[PDB]
Structure formats: C-alpha cells, structure tokens
DNA sequence: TTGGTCAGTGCA
DNA sequence: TGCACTGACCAA
C-alpha cells in the first residue's frame, strides 16, 4: 500500500496522480472530472453546479461557510449516468471498474 | 482569487 | 478495505 503514480489516460493529459489503496477512488474521479464539460456536481444548499468535487469543496468554503459538505462520495455521485461513465473510463478505467 | 494537486485517516 | 471527508502548498 505504498504511493505510486497512476497515469491519466485522457487524450494528451500528462498528469499522474499519486495513489494508494487507502485513498479509494474519489481523487481519481475528481481528476477525471477536470476533463468533463458537463456539470455533474450539484450543490445541496443552493442551485449551483460545477465540474469537479474539488470545485464543490471551494464552493462550500466560500458560499456556505457554516455548512458541512455532505454526500459527495462515490455513493452520492451519478455513477450510473452513461456520460459520467464515459469520462471515468477515458481516464482511469482500470481503477474505476468496481465503482458501481 | 480559484482550485488542481499532495498528504492524510477514523471508522464502517 | 476503502469510503468520504480533513488541511494545505502553490500554479494559474
Ligand atoms: Zn487527466
Ligand atoms: Zn451552493
């Protein structure tokens, strides 16, 4: 369970993500969403939507300073959506197989 | 300012 | 096991 870099397989993406098993899937999903033009992340306190989990972290920090960010793991994401799955499998298909 | 990254981990 | 959340460095 030592940190190893996982190369993103999105076309022309040169980013690798440092990864180990305790981390789980979320930071890989989060990087895959950088390549996504849909807005699958929906705020639970207002109508705002955005592309990545990280952007939603920044949204709660700035716009909902007294709220706890909740339900933004795998279990709370639209993992059965076909467009979502396409982006995931374009980036980290090997690591995001058992996502559902 | 925005937020992509690393690093981290208690508990089911 | 790995989920789903924490704090923080630093590029743009
Ligand atoms: Zn990538
Ligand atoms: Zn909001």
UniProtKB/TrEMBL annotation:
The chain holds residues 236 to 335 of 361 of the full protein. Coiled coil: none annotated. This is C2H2-type domain-containing protein. Residues 43-64 form the C2H2-type domain. Zn(2+) 2 binds at residues 43, 46, 59, 64. It comes from Caenorhabditis elegans. It comes from the Eukaryota. Zn(2+) 1 binds at residues 8, 13, 31, 35. The gene is him-8.
């Amino acid at each position: 369970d030592e940190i190893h870099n996982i190369q993103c397989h999105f076309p022309n993406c040169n980013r690798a993500i440092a990864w180990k098993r305790k981390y789980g899937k979320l930071r890989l999903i989060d990087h895959a969403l950088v390549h996504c033009d849909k807005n699958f992340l929906k705020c639970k306190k207002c109508k705002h939507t955005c592309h990545t989990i990280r952007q939603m972290r920044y949204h709660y920090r700035i716009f909902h300073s007294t709220s706890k960010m909740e339900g933004f793991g795998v279990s709370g994401l639209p993992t059965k959506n076909k467009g979502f799955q396409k982006i995931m499998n374009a980036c980290f298909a090997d690591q995001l197989v058992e996502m559902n």
